[PDB]
Design an enzyme around this catalytic site. Sequence first.
Site, PDB file in Angstrom:
ATOM      1  N   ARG A  38      11.989   2.357   0.622  1.00 50.14           N
ATOM      2  CA  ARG A  38      10.960   1.370   0.924  1.00 50.14           C
ATOM      3  C   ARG A  38       9.989   1.205  -0.248  1.00 50.14           C
ATOM      4  O   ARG A  38      10.409   0.935  -1.374  1.00 50.14           O
ATOM      5  CB  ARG A  38      10.349   1.728   2.285  1.00 50.14           C
ATOM      6  N   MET A  63      -8.366   7.316  10.025  1.00 47.69           N
ATOM      7  CA  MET A  63      -9.226   8.285   9.332  1.00 47.69           C
ATOM      8  C   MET A  63      -8.652   8.678   7.969  1.00 47.69           C
ATOM      9  O   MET A  63      -9.424   8.854   6.983  1.00 47.69           O
ATOM     10  CB  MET A  63      -9.388   9.521  10.233  1.00 47.69           C
ATOM     11  N   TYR A 100      -4.508   8.191  11.764  1.00 45.83           N
ATOM     12  CA  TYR A 100      -3.968   7.469  10.617  1.00 45.83           C
ATOM     13  C   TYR A 100      -5.110   6.725   9.902  1.00 45.83           C
ATOM     14  O   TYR A 100      -5.251   6.818   8.661  1.00 45.83           O
ATOM     15  CB  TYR A 100      -2.899   6.461  11.082  1.00 45.83           C
ATOM     16  N   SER A 109      -3.459   7.179 -15.310  1.00 47.16           N
ATOM     17  CA  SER A 109      -4.078   6.590 -14.140  1.00 47.16           C
ATOM     18  C   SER A 109      -3.388   7.058 -12.866  1.00 47.16           C
ATOM     19  O   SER A 109      -2.264   7.569 -12.884  1.00 47.16           O
ATOM     20  CB  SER A 109      -4.221   5.090 -14.256  1.00 47.16           C
ATOM     21  N   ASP A 112      -4.721   0.759   2.802  1.00 44.19           N
ATOM     22  CA  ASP A 112      -4.258  -0.098   3.893  1.00 44.19           C
ATOM     23  C   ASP A 112      -5.305  -1.196   4.081  1.00 44.19           C
ATOM     24  O   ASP A 112      -6.511  -0.933   4.222  1.00 44.19           O
ATOM     25  CB  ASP A 112      -4.129   0.705   5.196  1.00 44.19           C
TER      26      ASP A 112
HETATM   27  N1  LIG Z   1       4.769  -0.906   5.144  1.00 41.16           N
HETATM   28  C1  LIG Z   1       3.590  -1.464   5.405  1.00 41.16           C
HETATM   29  O1  LIG Z   1       3.496  -2.528   6.018  1.00 41.16           O
HETATM   30  C2  LIG Z   1       2.338  -0.832   4.998  1.00 41.16           C
HETATM   31  C3  LIG Z   1       2.321   0.238   4.145  1.00 41.16           C
HETATM   32  N2  LIG Z   1       1.145   0.832   3.779  1.00 41.16           N
HETATM   33  C4  LIG Z   1       1.139   2.050   2.906  1.00 41.16           C
HETATM   34  O2  LIG Z   1       2.050   1.849   1.845  1.00 41.16           O
HETATM   35  C5  LIG Z   1       2.695   3.118   1.498  1.00 41.16           C
HETATM   36  C6  LIG Z   1       4.190   2.895   1.485  1.00 41.16           C
HETATM   37  O3  LIG Z   1       4.543   2.315   2.775  1.00 41.16           O
HETATM   38  P1  LIG Z   1       6.004   2.515   3.445  1.00 41.16           P
HETATM   39  O4  LIG Z   1       7.038   2.394   2.398  1.00 41.16           O
HETATM   40  O5  LIG Z   1       6.094   1.635   4.652  1.00 41.16           O
HETATM   41  O6  LIG Z   1       5.968   4.054   3.930  1.00 41.16           O
HETATM   42  P2  LIG Z   1       6.915   4.855   4.980  1.00 41.16           P
HETATM   43  O7  LIG Z   1       6.288   4.934   6.331  1.00 41.16           O
HETATM   44  O8  LIG Z   1       8.264   4.275   4.743  1.00 41.16           O
HETATM   45  O9  LIG Z   1       6.763   6.323   4.331  1.00 41.16           O
HETATM   46  C7  LIG Z   1       7.003   6.557   2.931  1.00 41.16           C
HETATM   47  C8  LIG Z   1       7.540   7.958   2.795  1.00 41.16           C
HETATM   48  O10 LIG Z   1       6.508   8.864   3.215  1.00 41.16           O
HETATM   49  C9  LIG Z   1       7.129  10.134   3.184  1.00 41.16           C
HETATM   50  N3  LIG Z   1       6.440  11.068   4.054  1.00 41.16           N
HETATM   51  C10 LIG Z   1       6.178  10.929   5.400  1.00 41.16           C
HETATM   52  N4  LIG Z   1       5.689  12.009   5.946  1.00 41.16           N
HETATM   53  C11 LIG Z   1       5.720  12.963   4.929  1.00 41.16           C
HETATM   54  C12 LIG Z   1       5.379  14.343   4.880  1.00 41.16           C
HETATM   55  N5  LIG Z   1       4.958  15.071   5.923  1.00 41.16           N
HETATM   56  N6  LIG Z   1       5.600  14.981   3.704  1.00 41.16           N
HETATM   57  C13 LIG Z   1       6.032  14.273   2.646  1.00 41.16           C
HETATM   58  N7  LIG Z   1       6.382  12.977   2.561  1.00 41.16           N
HETATM   59  C14 LIG Z   1       6.211  12.392   3.760  1.00 41.16           C
HETATM   60  C15 LIG Z   1       8.580   9.932   3.666  1.00 41.16           C
HETATM   61  O11 LIG Z   1       9.523  10.629   2.807  1.00 41.16           O
HETATM   62  P3  LIG Z   1      11.026  11.023   3.346  1.00 41.16           P
HETATM   63  O12 LIG Z   1      11.684   9.734   3.796  1.00 41.16           O
HETATM   64  O13 LIG Z   1      11.625  11.568   2.095  1.00 41.16           O
HETATM   65  O14 LIG Z   1      10.854  12.057   4.445  1.00 41.16           O
HETATM   66  C16 LIG Z   1       8.686   8.399   3.729  1.00 41.16           C
HETATM   67  O15 LIG Z   1       9.968   7.918   3.346  1.00 41.16           O
HETATM   68  C17 LIG Z   1       2.166   4.146   2.512  1.00 41.16           C
HETATM   69  O16 LIG Z   1       1.115   4.945   1.964  1.00 41.16           O
HETATM   70  C18 LIG Z   1       1.663   3.259   3.673  1.00 41.16           C
HETATM   71  O17 LIG Z   1       0.616   3.796   4.496  1.00 41.16           O
HETATM   72  C19 LIG Z   1      -0.066   0.360   4.260  1.00 41.16           C
HETATM   73  C20 LIG Z   1      -0.154  -0.724   4.989  1.00 41.16           C
HETATM   74  C21 LIG Z   1       1.054  -1.384   5.504  1.00 41.16           C
END
Ligand SMILES: NC(=O)C1=CN([C@@H]2O[C@H](COP(=O)(O)OP(=O)(O)OC[C@H]3O[C@@H](n4cnc5c(N)ncnc54)[C@H](OP(=O)(O)O)[C@@H]3O)[C@@H](O)[C@H]2O)C=CC1
Lengths: 250, 248, 249, 250
Positions: free
Chosen positions: C13, C157, C155, C136, C142
């Site tokens: 993603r 928070m 989440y 950087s 979000d």
């Molecule tokens: N998609 C959206 O619409 C939005 C995204 N965002 C932010 O953008 C960023 C990327 O989004 P998105 O791609 O959807 O993210 P995902 O929900 O797909 O999560 C990204 C990755 O986070 C990793 N992750 C989850 N829990 C843990 C943990 N306990 N330890 C380590 N790694 C962990 C996973 O790795 P693995 O698969 O290897 O376990 C997962 O594949 C995030 O920070 C998200 O909050 C914000 C607003 C909206």
Amino acid sequence: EAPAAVVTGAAKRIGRAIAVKLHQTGYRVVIHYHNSAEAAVSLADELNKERSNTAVVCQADLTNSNVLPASCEEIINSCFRAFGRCDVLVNNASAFYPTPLVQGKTVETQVAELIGTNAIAPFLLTMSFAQRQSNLSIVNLCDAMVDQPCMAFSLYNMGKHALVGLTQSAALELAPYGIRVNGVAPGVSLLPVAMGEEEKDKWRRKVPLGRREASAEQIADAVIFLVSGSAQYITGSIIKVDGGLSLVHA
Amino acid sequence: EAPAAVVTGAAKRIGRAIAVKLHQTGYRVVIHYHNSAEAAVSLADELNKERSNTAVVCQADLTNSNVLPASCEEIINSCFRAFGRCDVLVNNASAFYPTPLVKTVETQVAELIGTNAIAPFLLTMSFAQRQSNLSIVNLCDAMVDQPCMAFSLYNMGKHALVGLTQSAALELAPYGIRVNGVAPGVSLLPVAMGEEEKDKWRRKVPLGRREASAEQIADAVIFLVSGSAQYITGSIIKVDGGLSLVHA
Amino acid sequence: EAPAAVVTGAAKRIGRAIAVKLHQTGYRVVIHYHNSAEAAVSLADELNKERSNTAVVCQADLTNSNVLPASCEEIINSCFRAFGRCDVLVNNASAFYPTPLVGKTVETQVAELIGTNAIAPFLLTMSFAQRQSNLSIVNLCDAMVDQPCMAFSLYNMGKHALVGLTQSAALELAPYGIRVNGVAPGVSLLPVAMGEEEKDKWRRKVPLGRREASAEQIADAVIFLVSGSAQYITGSIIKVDGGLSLVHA
Amino acid sequence: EAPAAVVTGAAKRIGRAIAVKLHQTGYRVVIHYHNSAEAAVSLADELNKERSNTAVVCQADLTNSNVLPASCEEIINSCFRAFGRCDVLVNNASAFYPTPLVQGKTVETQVAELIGTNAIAPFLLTMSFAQRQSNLSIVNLCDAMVDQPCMAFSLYNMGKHALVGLTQSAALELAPYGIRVNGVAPGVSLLPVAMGEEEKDKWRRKVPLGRREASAEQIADAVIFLVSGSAQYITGSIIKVDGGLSLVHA
Ligand SMILES: NC(=O)C1=CN([C@@H]2O[C@H](COP(=O)(O)OP(=O)(O)OC[C@H]3O[C@@H](n4cnc5c(N)ncnc54)[C@H](OP(=O)(O)O)[C@@H]3O)[C@@H](O)[C@H]2O)C=CC1
Ligand SMILES: NC(=O)C1=CN([C@@H]2O[C@H](COP(=O)(O)OP(=O)(O)OC[C@H]3O[C@@H](n4cnc5c(N)ncnc54)[C@H](OP(=O)(O)O)[C@@H]3O)[C@@H](O)[C@H]2O)C=CC1
Ligand SMILES: NC(=O)C1=CN([C@@H]2O[C@H](COP(=O)(O)OP(=O)(O)OC[C@H]3O[C@@H](n4cnc5c(N)ncnc54)[C@H](OP(=O)(O)O)[C@@H]3O)[C@@H](O)[C@H]2O)C=CC1
Ligand SMILES: NC(=O)C1=CN([C@@H]2O[C@H](COP(=O)(O)OP(=O)(O)OC[C@H]3O[C@@H](n4cnc5c(N)ncnc54)[C@H](OP(=O)(O)O)[C@@H]3O)[C@@H](O)[C@H]2O)C=CC1
Ligand SMILES: Nc1nc2ccc(C(=O)NCCc3ccc(Br)cc3)cc2s1
């Protein structure tokens, strides 16, 4: 053919840097100016020597009055007359001076200039740009320190806050037309020409990132980003370009 | 004597509730009106019956024009004339209507920026110039960052009023003049609006699926002018039932 | 030498698209992952085929615990062991699920949502700066933090805490020449398993084009912020939300 | 009967002023404390002398750990056990000290104390308060300077930002149960005991309104307003009580 941009207050300083960088990216440019006719024509000459028929000037007062709508209409018209299209509007022109609340310009002149140039002219230009209609967008030059204002600058601050409101309202309303609306908010960039070095250095010393003002190019870089295909999903965003200044407490 | 307050657009709806509640708290009041003379006088009569010679009216158009400064000067002066002092300015009067990007435009500017932002600025200047628990309260809008579609000039004016609130709070703090805001969400809905369209808004509000009464707005005004807010300046209190927290 | 970047949660993603674009820009990359080992390795193999010895993987849980500091130190160290430097940190990894106020325990929910979204970013930022040119950090924030989904308090928070870290670290690291910024998506890649009819409810709310952002559109803003075109930008958070955060209830 | 309020960290300083003023308003109070056992019991003594059976103490560490939820549940339970109801929660307790990013508590402990007391404990207390459920409300003590933070206070700042998030999220989610959630955000109020006088005056001089810190009472006043019948349509709002400090540029 090449896209076209209007930059307001483009004869000098940040507006020139924006017009130049847009030109270097391949835009045709309308260089708006008010008083700076020599500087404007000089810049247009330079750009046209680089690629011919790619820069024109356009004179207009952006003070609020009953003719400001026509003047704004005419700035946009000048882009279509010269280049056949208008892809980008940068609202850069700005009046900036103190208006103390406890006290040669009359107050209604101050209101006309500071609210007119900073807010009403951007609104009327936005209306004309949208009405006269690819990657269309508008970029408004905002101010990173709008919530921590200079003492005695209430009307200027009011105008820049109104411009934030326009950026948001216009992003919302124009999105259905494919027009993005965003802002770039400098902190301290090119200091006022009238300002002494000592006073300039007081401001410089406050900036966390490098203890120096933004160059005009650094501001223009963020404008170039927002108009670019790399910002195709960005609308209603205001990017601070302030070296961290707005994060610094009193 | 008793302290005195000016309330702009005080003849009806939110400004009337503000005037009444200030009066009930012991202020003498100037009821400003543009078109609503009958209503203004009726309120003054009701207030003076409660306490003799404690309420006066003041007519002024708050449209921006060559004469708005003089009008704003007069509103403040009318307080000092009636009551010998002016402790509180409530910038409540407001124009509200759509201005689509796609009345002449410059009249729309004069009303939606003039009444909503420029007149507050000029009243603030007159109030400060003519100077205790002194304070100014600006009626802002809780939905400033999630604006109604096609309301750009209105939204511009309310953002400018935020700017004024902060800039005047900073500049007048040395003079002991506090400057704050109260930002309603949906309150008394505009008279024009249909009941069905009103219901739609009601259901969106987290707190009780209802609009604010005017008096709820006034309650926040009363707090900000009171001795309980003597260290508060530059603050804008939302009074919106949580509406601004609700995503699309 | 080519600069190097750590991207957390880079297997899939958004984090995947960020690691790819950084690599295409000329970065060497550490691909951090938690559970998605096959996807992480697949990406590293694809990147190394493009240019040899430019991509490594690093496994770590970013849940808050006694051991999280050491894990975060080891993520940063992996970049220095692989590439001899660490120019960029992208705090992308995120847990995201409802935590109603009224089948994990509550302290597990706290550990995962606050650890991944906030604490792990902080510890990685500390390890990054301590180990130190266009340096950087970019934090994935979000855009809807002030208009949150119902029952997502933990989440929300964690993402607000991340704003705080972005600002605090920008101020504190500015003297070391390290810029710290954020990119705040609105609705980007939706869950694959989410029904199209539910996806459409979300898409319809976006002013700009009535669609979610692609992962690439999010990555584009990351690329800007780490680039020389953003050399004066620190403490800034760029929404990439199609105007979603401007839409009233 | 009289409504009841929990105030965390209520033995001293601002929490004490909040407990006193709530009590003066008609509330029965739980005075939570961690280390300040003498001052807690002394305050409860003082209030009970004024109206018998209207004050209890409750000891708890609000550092994050796997047992913090039980400690939070116990604080709320203490209010019900003493008074049969719990109308008001004030999240006032707070750890506050620098955690520099670049280098005798471990970092694990600094995270547990600063994020636990400022954010996690508020969340768990909110949970317990809501689960156990007139004019119900929660007030979180936030920080007016959270966007202009003190250098090297990243974990404190993170916690206070998280508390803003909680204030918003809980206001939205608990509104259907008639629970309002709001914040009060001091600027400089009672300065740290650890702080020298030259340093105190430096901070005082920055405050536009009066060049002085807020009294504890002035902070409490805003808490009293938000819990009152005069704030019945207010939820999700944070009132700065900062004398203009957050408006002042660097
Ligand atoms: N998609 C959206 O619409 C939005 C995204 N965002 C932010 O953008 C960023 C990327 O989004 P998105 O791609 O959807 O993210 P995902 O929900 O797909 O999560 C990204 C990755 O986070 C990793 N992750 C989850 N829990 C843990 C943990 N306990 N330890 C380590 N790694 C962990 C996973 O790795 P693995 O698969 O290897 O376990 C997962 O594949 C995030 O920070 C998200 O909050 C914000 C607003 C909206
Ligand atoms: N410089 C800085 O540090 C900062 C700048 N900004 C913003 O960035 C933008 C660029 O700043 P900067 O380059 O310093 O701007 P300037 O102060 O140099 O003003 C730019 C131009 O505005 C035009 N202008 C002024 N009044 C009028 C008017 N009545 N009618 C028409 N044009 C008018 C002038 O054109 P002419 O010369 O032709 O008369 C002037 O050259 C502005 O919007 C500014 O507020 C924000 C924060 C900090
Ligand atoms: N109502 C709500 O739900 C919301 C309220 N607000 C703010 O709350 C405040 C009060 O709202 P509300 O009571 O509904 O206001 P209204 O829109 O009903 O107008 C208030 C009064 O303002 C006066 N006024 C309007 N235009 C002018 C003008 N050009 N010159 C002089 N006076 C003028 C009128 O006085 P007269 O009748 O004497 O001519 C009018 O009765 C406003 O500032 C508004 O923006 C913010 C958002 C939502
Ligand atoms: N004072 C100011 O200038 C400002 C304060 N604020 C906020 O206002 C609130 C009140 O401020 P102030 O009175 O100065 O606060 P203090 O720093 O005096 O702390 C309040 C109480 O919190 C308790 N506390 C600390 N750590 C823990 C822990 N691990 N477990 C349980 N309780 C703990 C202590 O209880 P005990 O003594 O019993 O151990 C302490 O008395 C705080 O949230 C603060 O962040 C915001 C900005 C400015
Ligand atoms: N049209 C313009 N708008 C602005 C906005 C802000 C600034 C700026 O921040 N200048 C440096 C700070 C400054 C400059 C002059 C004074 Br008198 C006070 C502070 C400079 C300009 S020029």
